Design an enzyme around this catalytic site. Structure first.
Site, PDB file in Angstrom:
ATOM      1  N   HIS A  61      25.678   6.705 -26.232  1.00  0.00           N
ATOM      2  CA  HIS A  61      26.577   7.101 -25.179  1.00  0.00           C
ATOM      3  C   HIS A  61      25.998   6.393 -23.884  1.00  0.00           C
ATOM      4  O   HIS A  61      27.084   5.901 -23.039  1.00  0.00           O
ATOM      5  CB  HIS A  61      26.981   8.665 -25.050  1.00  0.00           C
ATOM      6  CG  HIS A  61      25.770   9.524 -25.013  1.00  0.00           C
ATOM      7  ND1 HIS A  61      25.299  10.153 -23.708  1.00  0.00           N
ATOM      8  CD2 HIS A  61      25.426  10.087 -25.962  1.00  0.00           C
ATOM      9  CE1 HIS A  61      24.489  10.961 -24.172  1.00  0.00           C
ATOM     10  NE2 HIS A  61      24.523  11.127 -25.603  1.00  0.00           N
ATOM     11  N   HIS A  91      20.291   8.091 -16.066  1.00  0.00           N
ATOM     12  CA  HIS A  91      21.122   7.311 -16.548  1.00  0.00           C
ATOM     13  C   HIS A  91      22.431   6.883 -15.881  1.00  0.00           C
ATOM     14  O   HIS A  91      22.306   7.346 -14.998  1.00  0.00           O
ATOM     15  CB  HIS A  91      21.438   7.967 -18.336  1.00  0.00           C
ATOM     16  CG  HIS A  91      22.201   9.153 -17.788  1.00  0.00           C
ATOM     17  ND1 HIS A  91      21.704  10.318 -17.929  1.00  0.00           N
ATOM     18  CD2 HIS A  91      23.959   9.482 -17.712  1.00  0.00           C
ATOM     19  CE1 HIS A  91      22.608  11.331 -17.288  1.00  0.00           C
ATOM     20  NE2 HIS A  91      23.794  10.681 -17.147  1.00  0.00           N
ATOM     21  N   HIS A  93      26.668   5.833 -16.025  1.00  0.00           N
ATOM     22  CA  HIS A  93      28.073   5.698 -16.555  1.00  0.00           C
ATOM     23  C   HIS A  93      28.716   4.506 -15.751  1.00  0.00           C
ATOM     24  O   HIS A  93      28.511   4.314 -14.482  1.00  0.00           O
ATOM     25  CB  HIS A  93      28.752   6.950 -16.061  1.00  0.00           C
ATOM     26  CG  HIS A  93      28.192   8.135 -16.514  1.00  0.00           C
ATOM     27  ND1 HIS A  93      28.656   8.933 -17.970  1.00  0.00           N
ATOM     28  CD2 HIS A  93      27.171   9.153 -16.176  1.00  0.00           C
ATOM     29  CE1 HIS A  93      27.847   9.805 -17.917  1.00  0.00           C
ATOM     30  NE2 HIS A  93      26.991   9.861 -16.924  1.00  0.00           N
ATOM     31  N   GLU A 103      32.004   8.928 -12.366  1.00  0.00           N
ATOM     32  CA  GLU A 103      32.610  10.103 -13.057  1.00  0.00           C
ATOM     33  C   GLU A 103      33.037  10.838 -11.817  1.00  0.00           C
ATOM     34  O   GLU A 103      34.311  11.272 -11.839  1.00  0.00           O
ATOM     35  CB  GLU A 103      31.566  10.667 -13.724  1.00  0.00           C
ATOM     36  CG  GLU A 103      31.023  10.043 -15.037  1.00  0.00           C
ATOM     37  CD  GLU A 103      30.232  10.774 -15.945  1.00  0.00           C
ATOM     38  OE1 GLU A 103      29.569  11.874 -15.827  1.00  0.00           O
ATOM     39  OE2 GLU A 103      30.928  10.948 -17.053  1.00  0.00           O
ATOM     40  N   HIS A 116      22.938   9.034 -12.530  1.00  0.00           N
ATOM     41  CA  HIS A 116      22.689  10.432 -12.642  1.00  0.00           C
ATOM     42  C   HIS A 116      21.114  10.483 -12.703  1.00  0.00           C
ATOM     43  O   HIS A 116      20.395  10.190 -13.769  1.00  0.00           O
ATOM     44  CB  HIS A 116      23.388  11.178 -13.609  1.00  0.00           C
ATOM     45  CG  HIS A 116      24.848  11.203 -13.569  1.00  0.00           C
ATOM     46  ND1 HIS A 116      25.780  11.327 -14.377  1.00  0.00           N
ATOM     47  CD2 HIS A 116      25.233  11.212 -12.171  1.00  0.00           C
ATOM     48  CE1 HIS A 116      26.893  11.519 -13.935  1.00  0.00           C
ATOM     49  NE2 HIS A 116      26.596  11.202 -12.596  1.00  0.00           N
ATOM     50  N   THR A 195      28.368  16.367 -17.939  1.00  0.00           N
ATOM     51  CA  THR A 195      29.499  15.595 -18.233  1.00  0.00           C
ATOM     52  C   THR A 195      29.541  15.204 -19.408  1.00  0.00           C
ATOM     53  O   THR A 195      30.712  14.297 -19.780  1.00  0.00           O
ATOM     54  CB  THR A 195      29.839  14.616 -16.984  1.00  0.00           C
ATOM     55  OG1 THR A 195      28.673  13.522 -17.318  1.00  0.00           O
ATOM     56  CG2 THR A 195      29.623  15.103 -15.702  1.00  0.00           C
ATOM     57  N   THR A 196      28.903  15.383 -20.407  1.00  0.00           N
ATOM     58  CA  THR A 196      28.966  14.960 -21.760  1.00  0.00           C
ATOM     59  C   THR A 196      28.534  16.331 -22.608  1.00  0.00           C
ATOM     60  O   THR A 196      28.013  17.352 -22.206  1.00  0.00           O
ATOM     61  CB  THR A 196      27.957  14.056 -22.248  1.00  0.00           C
ATOM     62  OG1 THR A 196      26.675  14.248 -21.844  1.00  0.00           O
ATOM     63  CG2 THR A 196      28.346  12.602 -21.680  1.00  0.00           C
TER      64      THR A 196
HETATM   65  C1  LIG Z   1      17.094  19.388 -25.755  1.00  0.00           C
HETATM   66  C2  LIG Z   1      18.243  19.799 -25.329  1.00  0.00           C
HETATM   67  C3  LIG Z   1      19.332  20.608 -25.404  1.00  0.00           C
HETATM   68  C4  LIG Z   1      20.237  20.350 -24.714  1.00  0.00           C
HETATM   69  C5  LIG Z   1      21.725  21.222 -24.616  1.00  0.00           C
HETATM   70  N1  LIG Z   1      20.479  18.954 -24.390  1.00  0.00           N
HETATM   71  C6  LIG Z   1      21.344  18.335 -23.720  1.00  0.00           C
HETATM   72  O1  LIG Z   1      22.323  19.000 -23.411  1.00  0.00           O
HETATM   73  C7  LIG Z   1      21.515  16.835 -24.002  1.00  0.00           C
HETATM   74  C8  LIG Z   1      22.377  16.213 -23.005  1.00  0.00           C
HETATM   75  N2  LIG Z   1      21.778  16.159 -21.661  1.00  0.00           N
HETATM   76  C9  LIG Z   1      22.572  15.760 -20.558  1.00  0.00           C
HETATM   77  C10 LIG Z   1      23.901  15.709 -20.693  1.00  0.00           C
HETATM   78  C11 LIG Z   1      25.003  15.141 -19.402  1.00  0.00           C
HETATM   79  C12 LIG Z   1      24.213  14.925 -18.270  1.00  0.00           C
HETATM   80  S1  LIG Z   1      25.077  14.511 -16.822  1.00  0.00           S
HETATM   81  N3  LIG Z   1      25.925  13.229 -17.373  1.00  0.00           N
HETATM   82  O2  LIG Z   1      25.973  15.528 -16.577  1.00  0.00           O
HETATM   83  O3  LIG Z   1      24.293  13.970 -15.948  1.00  0.00           O
HETATM   84  C13 LIG Z   1      22.599  15.217 -18.130  1.00  0.00           C
HETATM   85  C14 LIG Z   1      22.101  15.698 -19.340  1.00  0.00           C
HETATM   86  N4  LIG Z   1      19.064  18.463 -24.711  1.00  0.00           N
HETATM   87 ZN   LIG Z   2      25.766  11.451 -16.465  1.00  0.00          ZN
END
Ligand SMILES: Cc1cc(C)n(C(=O)CCNc2ccc(S(N)(=O)=O)cc2)n1
Ligand SMILES: [Zn+2]
EC number: 4.2.1.1
Length: 257
Positions: A61, A91, A93, A103, A116, A195-196
């Site tokens: 992603h 990371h 976007h 975003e 981010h 946001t994912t």
């Molecule tokens: C170990 C573990 C448990 C969960 C629920 N994880 C994530 O959610 C992975 C996704 N993390 C994530 C997703 C989006 C963003 S963002 N795009 O909003 O900055 C930051 C971090 N990881």
């Molecule tokens: Zn992000």
């Protein structure tokens, strides 16, 4: 599985993740005229002098630059935050064209990309417990515009050919994320979400007003990455952004007048 295609993109996510239609989803449009200056907001404290990057990963992603978060090192505090938040990864976007990719939007303006910097509240002990809490994460968002190159980004750019496809990783030590920060730390803040997927409502968003400029050549290299795995049909990793979501019952606060 979810993604950034015509049959599995943001408008579909709610079927597997029905918090997608929740009360504190991200990103949002920042209407700058109706964000209120809050004189109770503090300066943001960004302390990255001991940050220890370890690895960069194409997760299918985006790419994540990962940090050793097992010691008290790279921390975000102040701003709207209570307590301290530890950097785990950053990371981006970005778009297929310079006119889209961010975003968050600012008075409906879309930037070419958005960085981010993801941090978790130490009081919850680890990231996985933090994401279960409404004050579990603090994400520092920084807009990218295309113009002059960002010298502190080039090390990231140049490693990307080694992680072209999903599931590839590469050692990535000694990367200093201070080189990705604008001169000013003025910001907007509001309560929101990842946001994912899983789209968890665990984030205090801190979005810097000042964008960083990167060169066309630098973003062009982001756009050579692939969403697919090695040996699968090429799908360029572009337009990996979620559109602005309804603001609902939220206030965006400004740190500045
Ligand atoms: C170990 C573990 C448990 C969960 C629920 N994880 C994530 O959610 C992975 C996704 N993390 C994530 C997703 C989006 C963003 S963002 N795009 O909003 O900055 C930051 C971090 N990881
Ligand atoms: Zn992000």
């Amino acid at each position: 599985h979810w993604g950034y295609g015509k049959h599995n993109g943001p408008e579909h996510w709610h079927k597997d993740f029905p918090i997608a239609k929740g009360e504190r989803q991200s990103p949002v449009d920042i209407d700058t005229h109706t964000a209120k200056y809050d004189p109770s907001l503090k300066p943001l404290s960004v302390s990255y002098d001991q940050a220890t990057s370890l690895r960069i990963l194409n997760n299918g992603h985006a790419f994540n630059v990962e940090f050793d978060d097992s010691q008290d090192k790279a921390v975000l505090k102040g701003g709207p935050l209570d307590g301290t938040y530890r950097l785990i990864q950053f990371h981006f976007h970005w778009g297929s064209l310079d006119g889209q990719g961010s975003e968050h939007t600012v008075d409906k303006k879309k930037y070419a990309a958005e960085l981010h910097l993801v941090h978790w509240n130490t009081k919850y002990g680890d990231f996985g417990k933090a994401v279960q809490q409404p004050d579990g994460l603090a994400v520092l968002g920084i807009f990218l515009k295309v113009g002059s190159a960002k010298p502190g980004l080039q090390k990231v750019v140049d490693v990307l050919d080694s992680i072209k496809t999903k599931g590839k990783s590469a050692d990535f030590t000694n990367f200093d994320p201070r080189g990705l920060l604008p001169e000013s730390l003025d910001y907007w803040t509001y309560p929101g979400s990842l946001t994912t997927p899983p789209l968890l409502e665990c984030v205090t968003w801190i979005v810097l007003k000042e964008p960083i400029s990167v060169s066309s050549e630098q973003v062009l290299k982001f756009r050579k990455l692939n969403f697919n795995g090695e040996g699968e049909p090429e799908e360029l990793m572009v337009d990996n952004w979620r559109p602005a979501q309804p603001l609902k019952n939220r206030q965006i606060k400004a740190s500045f007048k």
